[PDB]
Amino acid sequence: EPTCNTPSNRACWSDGFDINTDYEVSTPDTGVTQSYVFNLTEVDNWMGPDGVVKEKVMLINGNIMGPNIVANWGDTVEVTVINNLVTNGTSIHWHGIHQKDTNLHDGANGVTECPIPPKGGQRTYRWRARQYGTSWYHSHFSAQYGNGVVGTIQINGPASLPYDIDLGVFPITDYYYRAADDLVHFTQNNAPPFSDNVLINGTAVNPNTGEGQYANVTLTPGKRHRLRILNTSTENHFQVSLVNHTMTVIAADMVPVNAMTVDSLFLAVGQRYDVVIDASRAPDNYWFNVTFGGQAACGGSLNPHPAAIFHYAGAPGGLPTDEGTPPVDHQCLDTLDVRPVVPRSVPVNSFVKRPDNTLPVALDLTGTPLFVWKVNGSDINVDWGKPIIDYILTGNTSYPVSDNIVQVDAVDQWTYWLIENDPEGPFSLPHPMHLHGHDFLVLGRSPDVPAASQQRFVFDPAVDLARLNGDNPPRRDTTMLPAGGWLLLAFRTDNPGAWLFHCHIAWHVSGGLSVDFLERPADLRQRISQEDEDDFNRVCDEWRAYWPTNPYPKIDSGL
Amino acid sequence: EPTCNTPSNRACWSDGFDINTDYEVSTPDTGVTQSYVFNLTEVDNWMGPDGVVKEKVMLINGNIMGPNIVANWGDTVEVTVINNLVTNGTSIHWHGIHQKDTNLHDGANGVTECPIPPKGGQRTYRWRARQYGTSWYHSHFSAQYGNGVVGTIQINGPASLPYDIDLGVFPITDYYYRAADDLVHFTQNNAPPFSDNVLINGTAVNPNTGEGQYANVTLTPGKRHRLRILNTSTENHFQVSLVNHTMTVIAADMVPVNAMTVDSLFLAVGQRYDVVIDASRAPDNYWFNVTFGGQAACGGSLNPHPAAIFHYAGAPGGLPTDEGTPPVDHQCLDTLDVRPVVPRSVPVNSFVKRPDNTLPVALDLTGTPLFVWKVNGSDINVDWGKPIIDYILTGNTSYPVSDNIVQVDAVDQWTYWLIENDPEGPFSLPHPMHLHGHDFLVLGRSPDVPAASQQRFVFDPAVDLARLNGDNPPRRDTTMLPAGGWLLLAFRTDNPGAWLFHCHIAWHVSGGLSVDFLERPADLRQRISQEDEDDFNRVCDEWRAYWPTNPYPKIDSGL
Ligand SMILES: *[C@@H]1O[C@H](CO)[C@@H](O[C@@H]2O[C@H](CO)[C@@H](O[C@@H]3O[C@H](CO[C@H]4O[C@H](CO)[C@@H](O)[C@H](O)[C@@H]4O)[C@@H](O)[C@H](O)[C@@H]3O)[C@H](O)[C@H]2NC(C)=O)[C@H](O)[C@H]1NC(C)=O
Ligand SMILES: *[C@@H]1O[C@H](CO)[C@@H](O[C@@H]2O[C@H](CO)[C@@H](O[C@@H]3O[C@H](CO[C@H]4O[C@H](CO)[C@@H](O)[C@H](O)[C@@H]4O)[C@@H](O)[C@H](O)[C@@H]3O)[C@H](O)[C@H]2NC(C)=O)[C@H](O)[C@H]1NC(C)=O
Ligand SMILES: *[C@@H]1O[C@H](CO)[C@@H](O[C@@H]2O[C@H](CO)[C@@H](O[C@@H]3O[C@H](CO)[C@@H](O)[C@H](O)[C@@H]3O)[C@H](O)[C@H]2NC(C)=O)[C@H](O)[C@H]1NC(C)=O
Ligand SMILES: *[C@@H]1O[C@H](CO)[C@@H](O[C@@H]2O[C@H](CO)[C@@H](O[C@@H]3O[C@H](CO)[C@@H](O)[C@H](O)[C@@H]3O)[C@H](O)[C@H]2NC(C)=O)[C@H](O)[C@H]1NC(C)=O
Ligand SMILES: *[C@@H]1O[C@H](CO)[C@@H](O[C@@H]2O[C@H](CO)[C@@H](O)[C@H](O)[C@H]2NC(C)=O)[C@H](O)[C@H]1NC(C)=O
Ligand SMILES: *[C@@H]1O[C@H](CO)[C@@H](O[C@@H]2O[C@H](CO)[C@@H](O)[C@H](O)[C@H]2NC(C)=O)[C@H](O)[C@H]1NC(C)=O
Ligand SMILES: *[C@@H]1O[C@H](CO)[C@@H](O[C@@H]2O[C@H](CO)[C@@H](O)[C@H](O)[C@H]2NC(C)=O)[C@H](O)[C@H]1NC(C)=O
Ligand SMILES: *[C@@H]1O[C@H](CO)[C@@H](O[C@@H]2O[C@H](CO)[C@@H](O)[C@H](O)[C@H]2NC(C)=O)[C@H](O)[C@H]1NC(C)=O
Ligand SMILES: *[C@@H]1O[C@H](CO)[C@@H](O[C@@H]2O[C@H](CO)[C@@H](O)[C@H](O)[C@H]2NC(C)=O)[C@H](O)[C@H]1NC(C)=O
Ligand SMILES: *[C@@H]1O[C@H](CO)[C@@H](O)[C@H](O)[C@H]1NC(C)=O
Ligand SMILES: *[C@@H]1O[C@H](CO)[C@@H](O)[C@H](O)[C@H]1NC(C)=O
Ligand SMILES: *[C@@H]1O[C@H](CO)[C@@H](O)[C@H](O)[C@H]1NC(C)=O
Ligand SMILES: *[C@@H]1O[C@H](CO)[C@@H](O)[C@H](O)[C@H]1NC(C)=O
Ligand SMILES: *[C@@H]1O[C@H](CO)[C@@H](O)[C@H](O)[C@H]1NC(C)=O
Ligand SMILES: COc1cccc(OC)c1O
Ligand SMILES: COc1cccc(OC)c1O
Ligand SMILES: [Cl-]
Ligand SMILES: [Cl-]
Ligand SMILES: [Cu+2]
Ligand SMILES: [Cu+2]
Ligand SMILES: [Cu+2]
Ligand SMILES: [Cu+2]
Ligand SMILES: [Cu+2]
Ligand SMILES: [Cu+2]
Ligand SMILES: [Cu+2]
Ligand SMILES: [Cu+2]
């Protein structure tokens, strides 16, 4: 609970805690728990928000999205998940939530847990809210989140600008009429489809029939409004803009940044931006437009103009009349101009590229099926029935090759990772890379070029070392690997655990595009509570009993 | 020579000849021949128009393009080509010129002729100008035209709109620093590059250094100007627009059409439009913009804003100040709205899909190299040393499989062709399909959707018969095969000969994307003159003597 957080002083939170606190090492002791139940059900012939009826969806508490999780900085969030699906296991991942010393609550099935079995299986997740901002949660059972197992998280806390009104969460997502497993199967041997529509805060209008509704945000004139934008898609990467207005960024993913005003923003899959919008224009109805850049390299939609309505309180109703002008083409790249309020500093002059710090991503067209993604020569394939945590708890170091384990033994040290985007393959795509358990620093990437250009770069020390930034670089949980190029990341090994690092395009991670950082495994085993161990074993026993009875095979990586 | 073609009556030509004459069956007997010599040379370290030096080019008469051929309707055009290259053969194709009963002057090496040998080989082409309009010529020796063996043709004649000034030819082309054989090799195993620049009437500014010059077209205030726009690219498909001005289309390819006013136009590779621009606006400098649509499915350039300057005479110099608005995205599709002045009508209700009228295009990824294009199961591969005409002249009917012979014995009948774009393959691309020896009627295509959306269509007669048009449809020599769809064409078998029908993207035809329509072969042999037969045998004899001495292999289809 805050004691000095006001519109004119959003920097302030409580005694000892403000915007400048190092929230990665200091957390309020509130002693409060916010708890929730997620009852997952399987619904056939479900009428969606654009008038179209979908074959099958998978819903939490019967709605298009799960509960909006809301708690304060330092609270505990607790969620009992009850799996009432017909065949699928399930696992809920808290995306953005670092799970400091609570790896077994990460929700990564095959890594930190077995799937919760269907027909009534249950598990209670429990995690400390040690970071304030906007995050989201979703199934990690193959591509199940594409069926509806998805929701948002708002952990209140201080901010880097003053503002009057918190408008709350604003999820934007691709929307397909075809069910997730059908799309996985299709994307194994075909290039991915455009989306059927793009939902903004759960609604859109049908581009063909005119059924459905525009999302409608009411602005209070003369007021500063915080809007928490999310990209909860399975594949589409979005550019957003508000006709006749600017947006001032105050956080990126779950990291507060210094105020940065822009005309439009790129959101990769899984990215978030908290913005402040001043209602200082003529009182009217204004379009909020979703657009695509990068020449379809990171998605498109069969709805030519997805949009919502920003309405000035006290103005006429009806539709905006100004279509406005197209935003700048972001070429499927997030901005590296953001600067966190709480700084970090690392050296970059000393980096040397070596097999043990290099992650080559490659598309393999030679095997079955056609599209298999490999990192360091291997497509990930987890075993839902023998998670990496099982090996840790039984002292088994014989990890299978397909688990893509990258063991990182350094204790609380900065580690450096060069990810290479198939520079020598016939074709290369942008990928939204996401790290569990940590925010990373984005130290540099290959020069910014048009996404579909097929321009290729290999890291050259004689030109690229000088292009890296170790002085308070963008710090967050998801960033873009450039088509045909490279990305250099760093994170500190402060959190023992098995942590996935993976492309967040569902079809890609389904296709193998992941590794698993095994951070400080010796330290990890010592830190697992008897409570966490017993319950991990309980779920695994139930999953292992269930699986032989399942009528469908596993046909992808499991993630 | 005309007698009644003036600015207010452009419809008039001479006694018996006007815009409504059927130029396909009636031609002025002028008795005049216009002759040219084309001297081909190989130039290394050539300084091109944007300031960059190219490794190697191949030039006609030492310039970036060959001579502008110009003659009157009914004239004879005669060109002596002297091949002074070091190693390559050559053969010049007159694109848009139907070669009525002159198949052996078509310039299709491996089909109508052996290539002209280097180190001084020569051949004289002679053909009748039985069509008036704007066409072009280029080498057909693999992708050699990508090195500079290219130029324009203007055959003067009547028009469908009055105009005051003929501005003449305005060729727009992609421009690569790499040589054609290097691009062919590259494209065999890799997605194709964006162009380095886009030249407009032989010039452009380097977007990095600012070296070079904009094309500068001077307009006469208050006058109507005919502009003859061509796309002479190897891969790039262009949208063109002129800030604050419309363009009135008066011909498409070499076929006069009823006036059609538009804001912007799409030109496929090989396509031409004659347009009339009225200098009716305020005197100033206006940008003529080249842009890309279809989300890169049909090209892009690394020059972000290729452009020319249209200057009103007596206005200030310098650069245009108004950037304008982007045109509508043409999604890599030419317009089907144009209507020829001289009409054709064919039945569409009787069309039945069968194997013998269907041409399935497919990318085969299983062989070597990676990107191989097949039509009806086979990638074309011609024998420069034994052209199809050789089989004809010796009465040998055992045509190799690789020659992709589609024999068509019908005498002067409409024939229907359904072209299918790999609807079952993992991804599909738009293709600019070009027919030698005829203009075709465009009877229909799959529904217009976004070029990069990977939506797929298979001809369904219950839905698609109704979408066909045989009431004076578009008639021309090049049109777009939609990404993932289909195209229905028709031509009348009025021209005995061996006629290529191919994608005009150099990299694809290199890769196998062609067939060879062997039209009425019995009639073909009787109409070949003793001079044509003798000279064919002369050039083949010299080519066959030369080839064993070539230090380089043929690495592609020959086309
Ligand atoms: C989790 O639960 C999911 C929901 O039941 C499971 O997905 C189902 O998985 C099976 C087996 O992979 C699929 O069954 C196949 O369906 C395909 C394709 O059907 C498509 O096309 C037909 C028309 O031909 C149309 O009827 C459908 O709408 C589809 O678009 C068949 O060709 C196969 O032979 C086979 O029957 C189901 O389609 C699929 N359902 C959905 C809605 O995705 C999934 O397996 C479960 N996962 C686990 C690990 O338990
Ligand atoms: C028609 O004439 C053309 C011009 O002479 C011929 O093209 C040449 O063909 C040869 C034989 O294949 C090529 O030689 C190969 O070159 C490649 C690539 O070298 C280039 O690129 C690399 C790297 O980007 C660069 O380092 C070089 O400096 C080159 O620019 C090499 O890998 C091989 O070692 C081999 O030498 C020529 O490069 C190619 N030249 C050009 C300018 O296109 C063509 O073969 C002739 N065709 C016929 C049928 O006679
Ligand atoms: C922001 O979103 C809005 C709403 O989706 C977009 O407005 C839409 O703009 C398009 C493009 O101009 C309009 O479609 C066109 O309309 C004309 C006239 O009917 C027609 O000739 C074209 O064929 C085309 O269909 C559309 O009416 C309009 N929608 C509404 C409800 O007003 C807007 O373009 C988006 N802005 C940006 C910058 O992305
Ligand atoms: C038609 O072609 C002209 C000429 O290429 C285009 O004009 C150019 O427009 C671009 C985009 O606005 C300008 O680039 C911008 O420059 C400013 C600095 O002044 C900078 O803020 C941006 O980062 C961007 O690079 C460019 O200056 C301008 N060129 C000239 C010589 O005026 C025009 O955009 C094209 N119009 C259409 C409809 O395609
Ligand atoms: C967006 O929501 C607002 C708020 O509910 C709607 O605004 C009202 O519009 C009606 C007429 O349609 C007026 O009579 C009210 O005075 C408005 N309220 C306020 C507070 O300004 C608006 O209609 C909605 N827009 C759409 C497209 O439905
Ligand atoms: C990527 O795979 C390569 C090949 O297995 C790994 O390279 C080895 O790294 C270990 C640890 O440094 C060394 O002992 C070996 O000498 C390396 N083998 C070879 C032949 O290079 C590499 O470590 C893997 N990288 C990552 C990030 O997981
Ligand atoms: C295309 O560019 C050529 C550049 O040569 C232009 O042709 C010249 O233009 C001037 C002025 O109109 C003529 O008087 C010269 O005699 C021409 N030279 C040659 C060799 O043809 C031409 O004008 C350009 N076309 C347009 C529309 O600007
Ligand atoms: C395009 O060409 C025209 C020539 O037709 C140039 O227009 C002249 O501009 C100069 C000033 O630079 C004037 O003194 C002349 O009087 C103009 N002549 C006419 C006939 O209008 C124009 O400068 C050229 N544009 C560019 C970019 O070079
Ligand atoms: C494409 O290839 C197939 C051969 O697989 C051709 O189909 C044959 O055509 C003849 C008629 O000319 C029929 O008698 C045979 O029954 C067909 N065979 C099959 C398997 O259907 C087809 O003609 C070819 N099409 C074109 C336009 O070349
Ligand atoms: C889950 O939701 C369904 C659908 O409303 C309901 O019938 C069921 O009893 C719920 N189960 C539990 C244990 O929450
Ligand atoms: C999002 O939609 C919900 C309805 O579920 C509404 O309560 C909320 O105000 C919306 N938020 C915005 C910013 O429009
Ligand atoms: C490691 O795990 C595998 C799979 O369960 C098992 O076969 C092997 O016996 C285990 N080894 C140890 C040391 O427990
Ligand atoms: C062609 O051009 C070259 C160089 O310009 C010249 O040496 C040669 O004599 C010319 N050859 C002929 C036959 O025209
Ligand atoms: C007919 O052509 C084929 C293909 O070149 C050839 O192998 C065969 O020898 C020819 N036969 C005659 C009689 O020339
Ligand atoms: C834009 O997205 C894509 C385009 C082409 C191929 C892909 O994966 C095989 C893919 O994911
Ligand atoms: C958009 O252009 C292309 C992309 C990928 C492969 C191609 O050749 C097979 C190609 O021509
Ligand atoms: Cl996370
Ligand atoms: Cl032709
Ligand atoms: Cu996530
Ligand atoms: Cu995550
Ligand atoms: Cu990816
Ligand atoms: Cu994950
Ligand atoms: Cu051509
Ligand atoms: Cu041609
Ligand atoms: Cu093609
Ligand atoms: Cu051709």
DSSP B251-268: EETTEEEEEEEES-EEE-
The candidate with the shortest Cα–Cα distance to A43, out of A85, A81, A83, A89, is A85
Measured between alpha carbons, how far is B100 from B493 in angstroms, rounded to an integer?
11
- Encoded tokens for A443: 């130290």
Helix (H), strand (E) at residue A530: helix A530-546
End-to-end CA distance of chain B: 36
Residues A60 and A97 in one domain: yes
The upper half-sphere exposure of residue B526, i.e. CA atoms within 13 Å in the direction of its Cβ, equals 6
| 8 A C-beta contact, residue A373 and residue A419 | no
CB distance A441 to A505 below 8 Å? no
Ligand nearest to the CA of A284: 5
Who among A189, A326, A454 is closest to B193 (CB)? A454
Q: Are B454 and B337 in contact (CB under 8 A)?
A: no
CA atoms of B548 and B183, how far apart (whole Å): 25
Structure tokens at B111: 């089909």
Q: Total structural domains in chain A?
A: 3
Rg over CA atoms, chain B: 22
> H/E/C letters for each residue in A52-93?
CEEEEEEEECCECCCCCEEEECCCEEEEEEEEECCCCCECEE
Q: How many angstroms does the Cα of residue B168 sit away from the middle of ligand 7? A: 9
Distance from the alpha carbon of residue B175 to the mean position of ligand 13, in angstroms: 26
Q: What is the amino acid identity at position B190?
A: N
What gap in Å lies between CA A98 and CA A256, rounded to an integer? Answer: 15
In this structure, the answer to whether residues A304 and A415 fall within a common structural domain is no
Among the partner residues A194, A370, A453, nearest to B300 by beta-carbon distance? A453
Determine the distance from the C-alpha atom of residue A432 to the mean position of all C-alpha atoms in its chain, rounded to a whole number. Answer: 9
Looking at residue B82, its amino acid is I
Q: Cβ neighbours of residue A470 under 8 Å, at least 6 residues apart?
A: A345, A346, A347, A348, A441, A443
B177 touches A: beta carbon within 8 Å: no
Could you tell me the strand order of the sheet in which B514-519 lies? B405-408, B514-519, B497-503, B431-435, B478-481
Q: Are A403 and A326 within one domain?
A: no
In three-state secondary structure terms, B97 is coil
Same domain, B291 and B360: no
Closest CA relative to residue A96, chosen from A257, A255, A248: A255
**Overall size of chain A counted in residues:** 559
Nearest CA in chain B to A190: B426
Exposed e or buried b per residue across A226-250, where buried means at least 16 C-beta atoms within 10 angstroms of its C-beta: bbbbbbbbbbbbbbbbbbebebbbb
Non-local (6+) Cβ contacts of A31 within 8 A are none
The β-bridge relationship of strands B497-503 and B514-519 is: antiparallel
A365 Cβ inside 6 Å of ligand 15: no
The gap from C-alpha A124 to its chain's centroid, in whole angstroms, comes to 22
| Under 8 Å between Cβ of A270 and A358 | no
Q: In chain A, what residues touch B457 (CB-CB under 8 Å)?
A: none
Structural domain ending residue among the three candidates B342, B371, B401: B342
Together in a domain, A99 and A69: yes
HEC-encoded secondary structure of B506-554:
HHHHHHCCEEEEEECHHHHHHCCCHHHHHHHHHHHHHHHHHHHHCCCCC
Alpha-carbon distance A537 to B193, whole Å? 53
> Which run of H or of E encompasses A494?
none
Q: In what order do the strands lie in the sheet with B486-492?
A: B372-375, B358-364, B414-421, B486-492, B440-445, B475-476
B165, B147: one domain: no
Residues A288 and A319 sit within 8 Å (Cβ to Cβ): no
Contact B426 A189 (CB under 8 A): yes
Enumerate residues 6+ apart whose C-beta is below 8 A from B533.
B393
Q: Name residues whose C-beta falls within 8 Å of residue B123's C-beta, 6 or more positions apart in sequence.
A: B80, B81, B113, B116, B535, B539
Q: Is B208 on the interface with A (CB under 8 A)?
A: no
Q: Does B371 touch chain A (CB under 8 A)?
A: yes
B257: which residues sit within 8 A by CB, 6+ positions away? Answer: B160, B249, B250, B251, B338, B339, B340, B341
Query: Is the domain of B113 the same as that of B217?
Result: no
Same domain? B385 vs B477:
yes
What six digits make up the tokens of B409?
């014995």
DSSP state of B448: P
- The rounded distance, in Å, linking the Cα atoms of B290 and B204 is 11
Which single residue is written with the structure tokens 């190693």? B87
Please report the atom of ligand 7 found closest to the CA of residue B227. 27
The answer to whether A60 and A39 have CB atoms below 8 angstroms apart is: yes
Q: B369: cis peptide before it, omega within 30°?
A: yes
A192, A300, A453 ranked by CB distance to B295: nearest = A300
Chain A contact set for B426 (CB, 8 A): 189-191, 370-371
A324 pairs with which residues across the strands? Answer: none
Token duo for residue A460: 């050259």
B390 and B313 belong to one structural domain: no
- Which ligand gives the minimal distance to the CA of B226? 7
Q: Which residues pair with B288 in a beta bridge?
A: B242, B308
Strands, DSSP E only, in A99-215? 121-128, 133-139, 150-156, 165-175, 197-200
Q: Measured on CA atoms in the order B269, B270, B275, B281, is the torsion positive or negative?
A: positive
Sign of CA dihedral B46, B52, B58, B63: negative
Residue at a domain's end among A322, A342, A362? A342
Angle of CA points B421, B443, B102, to nearest 5°:
90
Contact present, A224 and A278 (Cβ < 8 Å): yes
State the CATH number of the domain containing residue A23: 2.60.40.420
What is the Cα Rg of chain A in Å? 22
CA of B39 from ligand 13 middle (Å) equals: 6
Residue B222 burial (CB count, 10 A): 11
Q: Is any atom of ligand 10 closer than 6 Å to the C-beta of A34?
A: no
Measured CA angle at A532 (ends A529, A535), to 5 deg: 145
Please judge whether A300 and B450 are an interchain contact, meaning their C-beta atoms are less than 8 angstroms apart. Answer: yes
Structure tokens of B190?
């890799």
Task: Give yes or no: residues B333 and B365 share one domain.
Answer: no
Instruction: Please give the Cα distance from A440 to A499 (Å, whole number).
Output: 13
Residue type, B40: L
* DSSP secondary structure string for all residues of A15-32: TTEETTS-TTT-------
Number of helices and strands (H, E) in chain B? 6, 32
**What does this entry list as its resolution, in Å?**
1.8
What is the experimental method? X-ray
Contact indicator for B477, B99 with CB cutoff of 8 Å: no
B188 to chain A, any CB pair closer than 8 A? The answer is no
Nearest CA among B289, B298, B290, B235 for reference residue B450: B298
CA closest to A188 among chain B residues: B426
Nearest to A97, CA basis, from A60, A64, A62, A69: A69
A500 and A521 in a single domain? The answer is yes
- Spell A129-140 as b/e; 16+ CB within 10 A means b: bbbbbbbbbbbb
Pairing of strands B431-435, B497-503: antiparallel
Q: Tokens at residue B167, please?
A: 């501005």
CA distances from B496 to A287, A471, B99, B401 (A): 60, 74, 10, 21
Which residues lie below 8 Å from residue A13, measured CB to CB, with a gap of 6+?
Answer: A2, A3, A4, A5, A19, A21, A28, A73, A157, A158
CB atoms within 10 A of CB B393: 18
State the residue range of the domain holding A270: 159-342
Q: Where are the alpha helices (DSSP H) in B223-360?
A: none
Name the residue among A72, A40, A70, A75 with its Cα closest to residue A57.
A40
- Alpha carbon distance B78, B153 (integer Å): 12
Domain identity same for B176 and B320: yes
CA distances from A440 to A384, A410, A488, A517 (A): 27, 16, 10, 13
Distance CA B352, CA B366 (A): 32
Tell me which residue of B15, B65, B73 sits closest to B232, measured CA to CA. B65
Q: What residues does ligand 1 touch, defined as CB less than 6 Å away?
A: A 55-56, 87-88, 179, 181-182, 550, 552, 554
- CA B188 remoteness from chain centre: 22
Residue ending a domain, among A286, A318, A342, is: A342
DSSP states along B44-67: EEEE-TTSPEEEEEEEETTBSS--
Atom of ligand 8 nearest to the CA of B313: 21
List strand residue ranges (DSSP E) for B48-132, in order: 53-60, 69-72, 76-84, 92-95, 121-128
Taking one residue from A and the other from B, the number of pairs with CB-CB distance under 8 angstroms is: 67
Peptide bond into A369 cis (omega under 30): yes
Alpha carbon distance A115, A454 (integer Å): 39
